[PDB]
Design a protein around this ligand. Structure first.
Ligand SMILES: [Mg+2]
Length: 228
């Protein structure tokens, strides 16, 4: 049978990604453009993004931060500030639910497909618990949740895969629903068929590229295996 491993943010839920960085950058005296975000921050590791902002928008220079230890002190402050802002804007309800993803999720569930929630975020489970689908939480629709139990996509995907197999040994095919280029790579690394949801980035490395759910069928999956 089939197992599907779901990333959360960017797939089942949309949060403002650029916005957290913009606000941190604003409070250090600079303006983050969309152009800059796309070129030096988006899709890169958090600390690389942060260091790009601090150096190229002149914030190091402005504050007299000259040595590597001084730079490093501010880098880690800045990157922590950005996480703290992601947390606060989650606390303020700043997200939208992707009901069309939940649609496909429910469709796979009725055809006997097993579904794991597999986010690296500490907040995925909480949000999933509070979003309602019929007479339960979106969380309880999943057969399995491993969210926040590791801190990279590949480690959480790996964990979700091992647990899906333990619980259901007769699963033979794994899919990863993913919205980010790094996740597509993480999916391939654990031997899953990657379902690339392009809402913003293009995901050329993905086995199946799509722009909206419902453009997915259970039959698409079988077809993907396929030869797969
Ligand atoms: Mg994602």
């Amino acid at each position: 049978m089939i197992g599907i491993i779901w990333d959360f943010d960017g797939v089942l839920v949309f949060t403002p990604h650029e916005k957290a960085w913009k606000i941190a950058t604003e409070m250090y005296g600079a303006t983050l453009t969309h152009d800059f975000f796309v070129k030096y921050v988006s899709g890169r590791p958090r600390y690389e993004g942060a260091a790009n902002i601090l150096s190229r928008l002149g914030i190091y220079q402005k504050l007299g931060v000259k040595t590597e230890e001084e730079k490093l002190k501010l880098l880690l402050e800045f990157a922590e500030l950005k996480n703290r802002i992601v947390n606060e804007m989650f606390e303020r309800g700043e997200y939208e639910v992707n009901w069309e993803a939940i649609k496909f999720l429910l469709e796979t569930k009725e055809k006997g497909i097993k579904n794991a929630l597999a986010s690296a975020s500490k907040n995925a489970e909480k949000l999933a618990r509070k979003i309602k689908v019929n007479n339960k939480s979106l969380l309880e629709i999943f057969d399995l949740n491993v969210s926040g139990r590791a801190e990279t996509k590949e480690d959480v995907f790996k964990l979700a895969k091992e647990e899906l197999k333990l619980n259901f040994p007769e699963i033979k095919y794994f899919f990863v629903v993913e919205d980010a280029p790094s996740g597509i790579r993480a999916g391939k690394a654990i031997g899953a068929i990657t379902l690339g949801y392009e809402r913003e980035s293009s995901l050329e490395e993905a086995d199946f590229r799509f722009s909206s759910f419902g453009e997915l069928s259970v039959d698409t999956l079988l077809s993907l295996i396929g030869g797969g």
